[PDB]
mmCIF file of C-alpha atoms and ligand atoms in Angstrom:
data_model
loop_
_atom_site.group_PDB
_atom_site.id
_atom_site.type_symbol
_atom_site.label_atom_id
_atom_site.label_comp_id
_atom_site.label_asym_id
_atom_site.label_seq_id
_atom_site.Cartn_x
_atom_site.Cartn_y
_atom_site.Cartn_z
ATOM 1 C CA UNK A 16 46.356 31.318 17.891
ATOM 2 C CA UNK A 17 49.228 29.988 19.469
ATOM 3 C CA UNK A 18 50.726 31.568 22.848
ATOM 4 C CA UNK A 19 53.900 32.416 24.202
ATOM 5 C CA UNK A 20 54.971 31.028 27.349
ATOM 6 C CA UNK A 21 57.350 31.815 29.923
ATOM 7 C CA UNK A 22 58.628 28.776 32.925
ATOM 8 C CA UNK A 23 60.082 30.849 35.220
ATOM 9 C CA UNK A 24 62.246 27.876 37.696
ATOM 10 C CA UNK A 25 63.483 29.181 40.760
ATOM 11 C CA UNK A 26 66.226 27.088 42.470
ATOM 12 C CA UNK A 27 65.610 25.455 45.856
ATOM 13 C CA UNK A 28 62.419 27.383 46.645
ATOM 14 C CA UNK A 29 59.709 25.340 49.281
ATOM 15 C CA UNK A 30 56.363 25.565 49.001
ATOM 16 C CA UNK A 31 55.891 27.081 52.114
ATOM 17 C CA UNK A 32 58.214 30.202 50.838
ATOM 18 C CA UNK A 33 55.945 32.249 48.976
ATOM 19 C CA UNK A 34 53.397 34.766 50.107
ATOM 20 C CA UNK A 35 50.558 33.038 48.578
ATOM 21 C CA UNK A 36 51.049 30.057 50.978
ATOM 22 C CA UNK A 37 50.653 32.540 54.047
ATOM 23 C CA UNK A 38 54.356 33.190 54.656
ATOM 24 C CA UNK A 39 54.736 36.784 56.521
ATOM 25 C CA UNK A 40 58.049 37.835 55.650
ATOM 26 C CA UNK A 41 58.620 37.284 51.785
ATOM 27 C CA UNK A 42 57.867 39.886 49.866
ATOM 28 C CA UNK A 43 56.776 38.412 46.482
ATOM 29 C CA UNK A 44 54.306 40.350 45.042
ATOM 30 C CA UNK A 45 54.309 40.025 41.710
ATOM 31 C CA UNK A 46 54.137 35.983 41.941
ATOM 32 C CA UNK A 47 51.223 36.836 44.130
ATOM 33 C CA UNK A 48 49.720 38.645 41.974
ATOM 34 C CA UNK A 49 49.943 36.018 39.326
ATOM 35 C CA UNK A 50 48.696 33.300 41.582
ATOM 36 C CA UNK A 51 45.409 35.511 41.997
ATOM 37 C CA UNK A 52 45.731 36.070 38.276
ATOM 38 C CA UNK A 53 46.063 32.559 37.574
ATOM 39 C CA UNK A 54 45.366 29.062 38.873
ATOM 40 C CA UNK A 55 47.793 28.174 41.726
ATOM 41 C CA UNK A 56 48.905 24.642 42.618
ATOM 42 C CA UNK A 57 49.508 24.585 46.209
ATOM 43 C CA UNK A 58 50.344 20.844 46.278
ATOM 44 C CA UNK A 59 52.619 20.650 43.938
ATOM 45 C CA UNK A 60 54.842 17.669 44.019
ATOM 46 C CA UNK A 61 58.991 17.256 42.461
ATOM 47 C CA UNK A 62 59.591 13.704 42.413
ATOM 48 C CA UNK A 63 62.864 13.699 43.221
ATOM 49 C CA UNK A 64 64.367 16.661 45.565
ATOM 50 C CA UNK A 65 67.280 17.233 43.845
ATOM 51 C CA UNK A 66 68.208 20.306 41.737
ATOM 52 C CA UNK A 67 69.623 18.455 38.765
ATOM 53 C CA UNK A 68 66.942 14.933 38.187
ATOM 54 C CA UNK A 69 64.386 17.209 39.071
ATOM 55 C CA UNK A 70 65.592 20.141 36.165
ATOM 56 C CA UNK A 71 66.197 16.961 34.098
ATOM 57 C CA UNK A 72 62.926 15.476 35.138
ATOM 58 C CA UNK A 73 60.967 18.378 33.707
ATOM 59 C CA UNK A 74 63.209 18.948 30.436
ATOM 60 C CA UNK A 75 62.883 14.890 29.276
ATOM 61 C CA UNK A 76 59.190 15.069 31.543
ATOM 62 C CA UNK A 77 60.429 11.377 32.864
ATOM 63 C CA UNK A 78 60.756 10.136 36.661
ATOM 64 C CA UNK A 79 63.785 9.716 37.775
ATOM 65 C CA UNK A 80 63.008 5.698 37.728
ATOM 66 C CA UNK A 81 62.968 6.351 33.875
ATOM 67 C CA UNK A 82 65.887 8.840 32.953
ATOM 68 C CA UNK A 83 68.414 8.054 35.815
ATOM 69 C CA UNK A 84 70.708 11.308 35.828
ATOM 70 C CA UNK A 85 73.798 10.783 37.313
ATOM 71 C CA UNK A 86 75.962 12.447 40.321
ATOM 72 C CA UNK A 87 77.693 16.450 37.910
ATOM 73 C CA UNK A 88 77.251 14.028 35.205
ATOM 74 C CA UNK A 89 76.378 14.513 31.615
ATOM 75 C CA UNK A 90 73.172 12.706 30.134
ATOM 76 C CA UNK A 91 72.132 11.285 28.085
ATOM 77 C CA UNK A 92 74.372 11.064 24.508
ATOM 78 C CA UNK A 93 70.546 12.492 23.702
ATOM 79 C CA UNK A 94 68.079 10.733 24.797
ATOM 80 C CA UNK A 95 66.441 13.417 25.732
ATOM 81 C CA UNK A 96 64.546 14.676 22.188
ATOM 82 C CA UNK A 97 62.213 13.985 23.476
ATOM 83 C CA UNK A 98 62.669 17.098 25.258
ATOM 84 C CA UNK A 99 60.216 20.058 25.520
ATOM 85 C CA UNK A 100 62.199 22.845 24.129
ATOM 86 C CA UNK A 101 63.603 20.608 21.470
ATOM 87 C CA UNK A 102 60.223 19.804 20.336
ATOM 88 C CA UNK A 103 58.534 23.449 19.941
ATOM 89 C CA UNK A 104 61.982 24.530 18.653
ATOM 90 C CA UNK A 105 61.671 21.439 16.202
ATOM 91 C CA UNK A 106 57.693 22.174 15.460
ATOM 92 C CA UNK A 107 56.391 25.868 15.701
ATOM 93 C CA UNK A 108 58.370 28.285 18.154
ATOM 94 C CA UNK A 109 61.348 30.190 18.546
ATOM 95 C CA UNK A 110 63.017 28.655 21.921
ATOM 96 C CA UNK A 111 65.192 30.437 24.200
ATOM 97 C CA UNK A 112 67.058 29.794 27.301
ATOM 98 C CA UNK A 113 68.976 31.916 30.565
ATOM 99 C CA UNK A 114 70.221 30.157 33.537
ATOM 100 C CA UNK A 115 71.107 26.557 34.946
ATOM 101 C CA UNK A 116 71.014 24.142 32.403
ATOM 102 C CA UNK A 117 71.740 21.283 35.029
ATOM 103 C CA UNK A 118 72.750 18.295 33.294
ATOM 104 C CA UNK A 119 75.905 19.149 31.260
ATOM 105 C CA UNK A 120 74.852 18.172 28.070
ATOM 106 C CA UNK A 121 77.100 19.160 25.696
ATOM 107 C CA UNK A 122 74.960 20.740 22.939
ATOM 108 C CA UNK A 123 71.370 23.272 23.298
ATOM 109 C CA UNK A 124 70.243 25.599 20.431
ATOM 110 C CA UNK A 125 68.352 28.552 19.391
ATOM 111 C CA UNK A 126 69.288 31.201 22.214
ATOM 112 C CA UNK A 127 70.909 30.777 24.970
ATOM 113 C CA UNK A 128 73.137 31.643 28.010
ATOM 114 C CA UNK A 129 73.753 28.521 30.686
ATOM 115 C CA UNK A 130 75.639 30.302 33.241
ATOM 116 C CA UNK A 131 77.841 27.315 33.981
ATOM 117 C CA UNK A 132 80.263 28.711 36.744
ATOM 118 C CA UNK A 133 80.957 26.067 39.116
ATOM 119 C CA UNK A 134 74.860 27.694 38.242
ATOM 120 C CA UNK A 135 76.264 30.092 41.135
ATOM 121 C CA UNK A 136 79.202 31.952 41.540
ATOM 122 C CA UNK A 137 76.939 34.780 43.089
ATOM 123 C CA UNK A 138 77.917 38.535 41.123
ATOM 124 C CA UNK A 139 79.538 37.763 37.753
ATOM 125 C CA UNK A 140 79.990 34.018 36.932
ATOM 126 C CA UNK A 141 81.075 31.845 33.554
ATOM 127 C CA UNK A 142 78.197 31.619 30.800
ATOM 128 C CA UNK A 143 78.448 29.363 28.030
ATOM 129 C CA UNK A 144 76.454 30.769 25.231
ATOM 130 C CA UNK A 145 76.651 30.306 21.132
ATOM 131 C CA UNK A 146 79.688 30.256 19.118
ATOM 132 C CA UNK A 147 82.122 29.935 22.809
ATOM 133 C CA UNK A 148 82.285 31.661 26.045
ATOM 134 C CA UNK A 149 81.731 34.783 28.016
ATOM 135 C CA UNK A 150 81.451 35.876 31.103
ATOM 136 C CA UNK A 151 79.398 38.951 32.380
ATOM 137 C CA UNK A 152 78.756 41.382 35.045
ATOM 138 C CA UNK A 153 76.484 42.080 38.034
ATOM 139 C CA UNK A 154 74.588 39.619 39.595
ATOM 140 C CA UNK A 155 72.521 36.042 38.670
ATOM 141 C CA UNK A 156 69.068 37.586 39.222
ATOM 142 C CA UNK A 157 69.059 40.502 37.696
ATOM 143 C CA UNK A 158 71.752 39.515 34.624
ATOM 144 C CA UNK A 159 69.064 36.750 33.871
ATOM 145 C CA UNK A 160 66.473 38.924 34.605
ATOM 146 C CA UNK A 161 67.652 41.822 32.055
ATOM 147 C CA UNK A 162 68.363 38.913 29.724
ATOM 148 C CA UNK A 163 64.588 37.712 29.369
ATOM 149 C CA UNK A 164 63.547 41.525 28.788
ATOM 150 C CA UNK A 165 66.343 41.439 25.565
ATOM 151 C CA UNK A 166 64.446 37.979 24.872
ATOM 152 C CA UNK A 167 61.155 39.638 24.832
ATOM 153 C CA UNK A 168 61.928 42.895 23.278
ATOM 154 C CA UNK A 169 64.605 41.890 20.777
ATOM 155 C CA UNK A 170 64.525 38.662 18.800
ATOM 156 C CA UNK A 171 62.653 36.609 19.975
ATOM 157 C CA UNK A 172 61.206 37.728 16.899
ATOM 158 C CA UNK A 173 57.247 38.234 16.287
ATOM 159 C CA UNK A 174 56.515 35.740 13.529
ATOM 160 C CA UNK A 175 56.459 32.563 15.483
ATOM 161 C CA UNK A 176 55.747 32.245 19.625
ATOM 162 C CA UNK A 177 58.434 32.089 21.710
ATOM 163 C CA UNK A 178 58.825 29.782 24.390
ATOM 164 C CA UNK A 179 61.311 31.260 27.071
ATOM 165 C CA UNK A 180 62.977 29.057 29.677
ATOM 166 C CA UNK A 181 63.985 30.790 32.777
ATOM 167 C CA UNK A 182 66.395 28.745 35.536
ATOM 168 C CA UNK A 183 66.937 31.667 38.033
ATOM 169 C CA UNK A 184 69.833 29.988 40.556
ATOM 170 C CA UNK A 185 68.320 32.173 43.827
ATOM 171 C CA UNK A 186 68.028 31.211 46.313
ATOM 172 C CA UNK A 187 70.421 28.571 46.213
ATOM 173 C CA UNK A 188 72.979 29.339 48.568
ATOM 174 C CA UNK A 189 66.031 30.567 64.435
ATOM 175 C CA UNK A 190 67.673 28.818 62.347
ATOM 176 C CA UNK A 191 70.688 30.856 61.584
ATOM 177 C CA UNK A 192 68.276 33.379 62.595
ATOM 178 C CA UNK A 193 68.950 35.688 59.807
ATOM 179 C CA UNK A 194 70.398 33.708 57.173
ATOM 180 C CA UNK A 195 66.341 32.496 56.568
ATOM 181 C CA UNK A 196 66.242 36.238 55.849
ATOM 182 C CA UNK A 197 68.939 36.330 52.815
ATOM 183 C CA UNK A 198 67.296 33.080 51.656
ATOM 184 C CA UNK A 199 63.889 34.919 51.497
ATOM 185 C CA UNK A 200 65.710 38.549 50.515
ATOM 186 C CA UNK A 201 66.961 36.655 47.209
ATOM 187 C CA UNK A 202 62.800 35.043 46.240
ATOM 188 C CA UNK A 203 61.812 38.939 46.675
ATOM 189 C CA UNK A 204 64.747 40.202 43.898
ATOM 190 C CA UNK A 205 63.181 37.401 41.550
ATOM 191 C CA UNK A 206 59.838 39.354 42.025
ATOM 192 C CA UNK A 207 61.363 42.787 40.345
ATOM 193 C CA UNK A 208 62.184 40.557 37.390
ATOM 194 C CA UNK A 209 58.765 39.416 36.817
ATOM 195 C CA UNK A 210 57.602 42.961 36.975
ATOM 196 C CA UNK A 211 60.022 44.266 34.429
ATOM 197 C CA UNK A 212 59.359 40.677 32.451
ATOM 198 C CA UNK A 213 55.397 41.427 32.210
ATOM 199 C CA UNK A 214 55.847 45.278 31.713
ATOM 200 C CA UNK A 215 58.060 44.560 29.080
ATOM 201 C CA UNK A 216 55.416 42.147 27.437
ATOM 202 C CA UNK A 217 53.174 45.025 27.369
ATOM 203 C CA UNK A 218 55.558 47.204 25.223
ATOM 204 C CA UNK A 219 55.793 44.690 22.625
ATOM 205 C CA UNK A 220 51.571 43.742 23.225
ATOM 206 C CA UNK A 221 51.624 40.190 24.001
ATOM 207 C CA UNK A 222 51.084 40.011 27.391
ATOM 208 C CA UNK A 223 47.430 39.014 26.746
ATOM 209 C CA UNK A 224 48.902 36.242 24.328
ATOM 210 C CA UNK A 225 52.017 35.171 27.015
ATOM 211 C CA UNK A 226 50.859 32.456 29.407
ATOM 212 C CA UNK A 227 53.437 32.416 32.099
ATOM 213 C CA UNK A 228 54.337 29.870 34.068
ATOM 214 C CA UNK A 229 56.366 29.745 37.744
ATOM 215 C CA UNK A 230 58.079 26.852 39.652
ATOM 216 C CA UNK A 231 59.979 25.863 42.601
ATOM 217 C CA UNK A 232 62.904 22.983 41.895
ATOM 218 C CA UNK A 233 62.960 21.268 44.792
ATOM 219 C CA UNK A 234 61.610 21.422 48.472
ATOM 220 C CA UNK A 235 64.028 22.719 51.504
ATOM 221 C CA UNK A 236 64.973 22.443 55.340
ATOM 222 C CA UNK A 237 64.814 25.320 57.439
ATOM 223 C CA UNK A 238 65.011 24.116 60.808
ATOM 224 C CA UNK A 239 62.881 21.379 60.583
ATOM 225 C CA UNK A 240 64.065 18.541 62.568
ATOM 226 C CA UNK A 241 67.086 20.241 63.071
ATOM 227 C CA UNK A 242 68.078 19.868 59.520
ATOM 228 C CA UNK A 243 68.540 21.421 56.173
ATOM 229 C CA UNK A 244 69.116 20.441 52.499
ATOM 230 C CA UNK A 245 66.831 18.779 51.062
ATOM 231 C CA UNK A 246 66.664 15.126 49.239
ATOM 232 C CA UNK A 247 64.672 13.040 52.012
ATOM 233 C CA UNK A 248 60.690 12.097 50.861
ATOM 234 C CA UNK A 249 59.449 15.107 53.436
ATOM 235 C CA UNK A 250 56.612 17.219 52.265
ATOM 236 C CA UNK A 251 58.558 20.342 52.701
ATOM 237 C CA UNK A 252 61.165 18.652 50.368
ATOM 238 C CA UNK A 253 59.013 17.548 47.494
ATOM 239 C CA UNK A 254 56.210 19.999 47.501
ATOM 240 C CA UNK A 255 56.880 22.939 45.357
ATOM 241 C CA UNK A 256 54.868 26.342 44.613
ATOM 242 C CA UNK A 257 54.060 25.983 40.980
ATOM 243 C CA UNK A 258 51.708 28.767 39.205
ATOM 244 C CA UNK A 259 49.817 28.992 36.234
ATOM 245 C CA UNK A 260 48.482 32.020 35.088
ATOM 246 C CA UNK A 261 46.885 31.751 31.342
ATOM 247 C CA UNK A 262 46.033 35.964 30.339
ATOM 248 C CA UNK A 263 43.699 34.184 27.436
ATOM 249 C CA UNK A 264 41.934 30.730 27.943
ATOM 250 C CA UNK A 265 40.497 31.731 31.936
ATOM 251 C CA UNK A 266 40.598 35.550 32.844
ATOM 252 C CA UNK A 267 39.987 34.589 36.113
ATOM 253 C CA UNK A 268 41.780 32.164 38.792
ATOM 254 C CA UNK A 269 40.696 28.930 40.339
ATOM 255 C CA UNK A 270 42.835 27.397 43.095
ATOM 256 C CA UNK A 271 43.815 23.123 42.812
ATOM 257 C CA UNK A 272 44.916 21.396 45.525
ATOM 258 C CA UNK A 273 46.488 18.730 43.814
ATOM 259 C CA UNK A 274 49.347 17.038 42.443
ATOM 260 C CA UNK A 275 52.789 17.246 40.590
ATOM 261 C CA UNK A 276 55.650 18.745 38.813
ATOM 262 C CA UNK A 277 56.594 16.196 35.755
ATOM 263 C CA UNK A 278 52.692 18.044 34.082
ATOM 264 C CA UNK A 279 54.647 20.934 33.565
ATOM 265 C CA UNK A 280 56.431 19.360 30.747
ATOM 266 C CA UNK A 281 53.262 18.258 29.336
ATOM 267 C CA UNK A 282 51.497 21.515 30.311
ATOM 268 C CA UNK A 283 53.910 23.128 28.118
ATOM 269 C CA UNK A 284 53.871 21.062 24.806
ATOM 270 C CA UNK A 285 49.908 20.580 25.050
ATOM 271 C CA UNK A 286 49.666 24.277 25.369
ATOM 272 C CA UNK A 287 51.944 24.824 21.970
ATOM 273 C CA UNK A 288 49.526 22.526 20.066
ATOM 274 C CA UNK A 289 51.961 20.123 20.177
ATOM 275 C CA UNK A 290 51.606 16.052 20.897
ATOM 276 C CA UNK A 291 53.778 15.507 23.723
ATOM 277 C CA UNK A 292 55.951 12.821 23.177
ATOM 278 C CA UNK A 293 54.835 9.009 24.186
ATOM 279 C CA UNK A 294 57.697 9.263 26.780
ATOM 280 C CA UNK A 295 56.812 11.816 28.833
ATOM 281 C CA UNK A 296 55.221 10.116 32.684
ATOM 282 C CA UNK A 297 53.613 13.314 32.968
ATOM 283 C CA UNK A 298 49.750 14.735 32.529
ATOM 284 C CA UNK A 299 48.827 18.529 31.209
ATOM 285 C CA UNK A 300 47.528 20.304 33.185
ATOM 286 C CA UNK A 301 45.351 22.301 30.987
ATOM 287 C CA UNK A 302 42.350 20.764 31.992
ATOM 288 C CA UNK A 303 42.260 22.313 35.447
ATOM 289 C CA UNK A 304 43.353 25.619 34.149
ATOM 290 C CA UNK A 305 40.862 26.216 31.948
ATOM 291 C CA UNK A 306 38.352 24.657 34.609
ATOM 292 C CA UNK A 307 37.265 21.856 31.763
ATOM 293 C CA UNK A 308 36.926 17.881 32.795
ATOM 294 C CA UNK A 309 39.002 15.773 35.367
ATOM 295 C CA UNK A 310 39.151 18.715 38.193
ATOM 296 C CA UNK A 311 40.061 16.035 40.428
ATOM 297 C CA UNK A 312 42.943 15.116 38.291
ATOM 298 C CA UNK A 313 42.376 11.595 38.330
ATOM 299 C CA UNK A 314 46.351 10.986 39.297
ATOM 300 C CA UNK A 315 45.217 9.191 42.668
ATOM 301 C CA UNK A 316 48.848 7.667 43.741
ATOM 302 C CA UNK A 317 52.179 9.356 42.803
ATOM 303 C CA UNK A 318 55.821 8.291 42.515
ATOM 304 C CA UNK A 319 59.110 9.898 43.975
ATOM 305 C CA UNK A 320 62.418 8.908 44.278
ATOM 306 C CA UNK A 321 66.032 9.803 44.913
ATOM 307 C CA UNK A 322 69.008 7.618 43.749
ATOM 308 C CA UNK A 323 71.900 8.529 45.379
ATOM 309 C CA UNK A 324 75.569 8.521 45.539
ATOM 310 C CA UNK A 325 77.447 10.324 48.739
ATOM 311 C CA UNK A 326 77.014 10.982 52.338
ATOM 312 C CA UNK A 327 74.266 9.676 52.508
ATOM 313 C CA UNK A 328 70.578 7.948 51.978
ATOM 314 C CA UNK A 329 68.346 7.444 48.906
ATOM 315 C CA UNK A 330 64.502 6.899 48.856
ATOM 316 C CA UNK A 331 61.704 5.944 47.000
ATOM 317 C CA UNK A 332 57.736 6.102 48.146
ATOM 318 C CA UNK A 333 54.518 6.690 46.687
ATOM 319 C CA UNK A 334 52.049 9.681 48.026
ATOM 320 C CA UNK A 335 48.439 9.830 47.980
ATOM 321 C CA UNK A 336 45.708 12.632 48.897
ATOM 322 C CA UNK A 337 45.890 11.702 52.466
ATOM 323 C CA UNK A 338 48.738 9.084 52.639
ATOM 324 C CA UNK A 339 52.296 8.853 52.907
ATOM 325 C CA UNK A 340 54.590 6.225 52.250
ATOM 326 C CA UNK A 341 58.541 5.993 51.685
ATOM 327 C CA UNK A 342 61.193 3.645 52.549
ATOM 328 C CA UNK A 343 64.970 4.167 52.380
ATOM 329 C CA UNK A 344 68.105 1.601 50.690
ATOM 330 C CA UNK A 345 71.646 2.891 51.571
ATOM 331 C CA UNK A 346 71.974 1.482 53.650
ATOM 332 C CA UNK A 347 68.536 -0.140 55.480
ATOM 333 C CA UNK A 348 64.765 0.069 54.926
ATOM 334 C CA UNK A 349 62.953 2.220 56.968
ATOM 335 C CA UNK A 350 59.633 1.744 56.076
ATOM 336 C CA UNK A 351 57.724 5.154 57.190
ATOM 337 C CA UNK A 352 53.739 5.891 56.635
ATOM 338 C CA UNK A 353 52.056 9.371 57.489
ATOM 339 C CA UNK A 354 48.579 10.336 57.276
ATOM 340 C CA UNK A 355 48.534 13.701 55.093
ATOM 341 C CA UNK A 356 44.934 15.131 56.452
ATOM 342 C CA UNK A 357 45.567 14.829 60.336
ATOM 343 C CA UNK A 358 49.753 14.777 60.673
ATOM 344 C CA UNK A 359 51.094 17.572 57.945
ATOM 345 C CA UNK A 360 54.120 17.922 59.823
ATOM 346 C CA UNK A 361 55.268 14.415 59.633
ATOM 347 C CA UNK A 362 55.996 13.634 63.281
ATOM 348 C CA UNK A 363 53.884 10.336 63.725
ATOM 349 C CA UNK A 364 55.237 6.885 61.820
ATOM 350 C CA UNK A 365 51.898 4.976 61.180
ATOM 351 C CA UNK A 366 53.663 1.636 59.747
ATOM 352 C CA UNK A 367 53.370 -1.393 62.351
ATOM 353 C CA UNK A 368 50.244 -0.404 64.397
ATOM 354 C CA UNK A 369 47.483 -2.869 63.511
ATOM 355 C CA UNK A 370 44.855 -0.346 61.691
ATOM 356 C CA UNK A 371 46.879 1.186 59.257
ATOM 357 C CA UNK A 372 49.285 -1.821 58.448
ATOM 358 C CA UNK A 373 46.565 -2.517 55.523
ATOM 359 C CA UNK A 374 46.852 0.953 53.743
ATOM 360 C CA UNK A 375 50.580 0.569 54.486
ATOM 361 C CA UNK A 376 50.517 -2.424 52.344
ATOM 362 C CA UNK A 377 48.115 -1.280 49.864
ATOM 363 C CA UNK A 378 50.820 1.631 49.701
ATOM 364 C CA UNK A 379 53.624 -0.635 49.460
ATOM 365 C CA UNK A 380 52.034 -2.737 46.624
ATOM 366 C CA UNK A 381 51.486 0.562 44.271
ATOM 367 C CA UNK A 382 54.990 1.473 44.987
ATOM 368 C CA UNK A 383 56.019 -1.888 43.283
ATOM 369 C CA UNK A 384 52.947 -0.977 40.952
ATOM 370 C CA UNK A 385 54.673 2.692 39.860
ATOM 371 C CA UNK A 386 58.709 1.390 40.177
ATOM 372 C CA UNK A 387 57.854 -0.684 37.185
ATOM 373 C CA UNK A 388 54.965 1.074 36.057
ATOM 374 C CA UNK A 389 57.876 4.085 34.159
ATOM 375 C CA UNK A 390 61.061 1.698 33.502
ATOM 376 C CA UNK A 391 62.793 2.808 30.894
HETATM 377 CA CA1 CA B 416 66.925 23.684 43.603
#
């Protein structure tokens, strides 16, 4: 009646890095498989490119306009409950958590283990858990990994659904000819969790009751105009692989080619039978799952945002099916417009030149009308 669901979140992994997208040289089958098993989202959007607003943005499902994070920095004395795990802990399902937390709140319940070592720390690493502390041995991906199998097969126990929260911290650390290898290497040890994750859901006979879900946090550089990191309002920075795969409602897949990462949030509570909060500037994506109404998802303009601290720039812009807009504070304004359909790679600024300078400022005007539009 009501299904178990897995968010798998995989830290700092683009769009582009995943075999479904037509990369050569990962090896992630299993998240393949699931994105022919499921309905993929190849435009998938993270409003703010940042591994911490972003992870907040999908726990309180609120732009970054709305929550504000902070550098590090704990938020918020909870607001934040409000919060999708909270609420299905709080209303019908047995919550559980492994990984990067990412906000440094100072509280979290059920089951857990944030592994809070400096996220990273690569083999072995501090994990704050129930009762205190302790620290454990081998390696983030697979101690996480072997962690959701004990979720699955111990108690997490059958009376209730479970809803299990995975933050896996790979890959988070021409060009560097090689080291685009290890990035890639550490997506493809991610997969051999997923396979032990579903096999093990077969043991205990849910997997046709488990909906699992996968994410990217944020975009990534790799070369591209000489740079790397992340943060700026680029479409390898915001776009994300996200993938749906419901073993009930659709046996078969459909593929979207549409828009954003704040749904997931809503795609989560709306899937436990649960009315989302009135906070939450998200949309569930259910209906394009399921292939029921608004397959054009009716979100025509989007928001994203970055507000920033050190060395250096922040940005805020609005992005549309075939437009791109985004203008940067600290310290100028460098207005910047792309066209999505004929420039994907971004290398053609559209703002001044007489026949575009009207969508620029239709652009600009919904940016104003979506700053405001979230608040507080
Ligand atoms: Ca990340």
């Amino acid at each position: 009646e009501k299904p178990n669901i897995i968010f798998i979140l995989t830290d700092d992994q683009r769009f582009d890095a995943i075999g479904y997208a037509g990369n050569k040289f990962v090896n992630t089958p299993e998240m393949d498989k699931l994105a022919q098993q499921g309905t993929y989202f190849d435009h998938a959007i993270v409003t703010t490119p940042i591994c911490a607003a972003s992870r907040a943005s999908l726990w309180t499902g609120l732009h970054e306009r709305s929550h504000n994070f902070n550098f590090t920095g704990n938020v918020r004395e909870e607001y934040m409950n409000n919060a999708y795990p909270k609420l299905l802990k709080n209303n019908g399902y047995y919550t559980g958590f492994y990984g990067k937390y990412g906000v440094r709140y100072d509280n979290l319940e059920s089951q857990f283990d944030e592994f809070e070592s400096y996220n990273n720390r690569y083999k072995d690493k501090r994990g704050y858990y129930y009762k205190t502390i302790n620290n454990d041995t081998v390696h983030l991906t697979r101690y996480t990994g072997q962690q959701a199998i004990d979720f699955i097969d111990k108690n997490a126990t059958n009376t209730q659904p479970f809803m299990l929260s995975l933050s896996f911290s790979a890959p988070h650390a021409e060009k560097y000819q090689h080291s685009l290898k290890g990035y890639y290497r550490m997506i493809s040890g991610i997969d051999l969790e997923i396979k032990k994750i579903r096999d093990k859901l077969k043991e205990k006979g849910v997997d046709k009751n488990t909906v699992i879900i996968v994410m990217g946090d944020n975009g990534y550089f790799l070369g591209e105009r000489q740079l790397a990191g992340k943060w700026l309002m680029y479409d390898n920075s915001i776009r994300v692989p996200l993938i749906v795969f419901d073993p009930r409602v659709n046996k078969h897949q459909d593929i979207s080619e549409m828009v954003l990462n704040i749904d997931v949030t809503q795609t989560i509570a709306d899937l436990a039978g649960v009315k989302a909060p009135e906070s939450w500037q998200g949309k569930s994506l259910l209906p394009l799952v399921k292939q029921e109404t608004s397959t054009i998802s009716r979100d025509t303009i989007l928001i994203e945002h970055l507000w920033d601290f050190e060395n250096i720039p922040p940005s805020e812009g609005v992005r549309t099916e075939e437009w791109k807009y985004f203008r940067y504070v600290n310290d100028k304004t460098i207005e910047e417009l792309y066209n999505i359909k004929k420039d994907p790679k971004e290398i053609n600024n559209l703002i001044g030149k007489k026949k575009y300078q009207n969508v620029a400022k239709a652009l600009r005007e919904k940016l104003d009308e979506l700053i405001a539009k979230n608040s507080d």
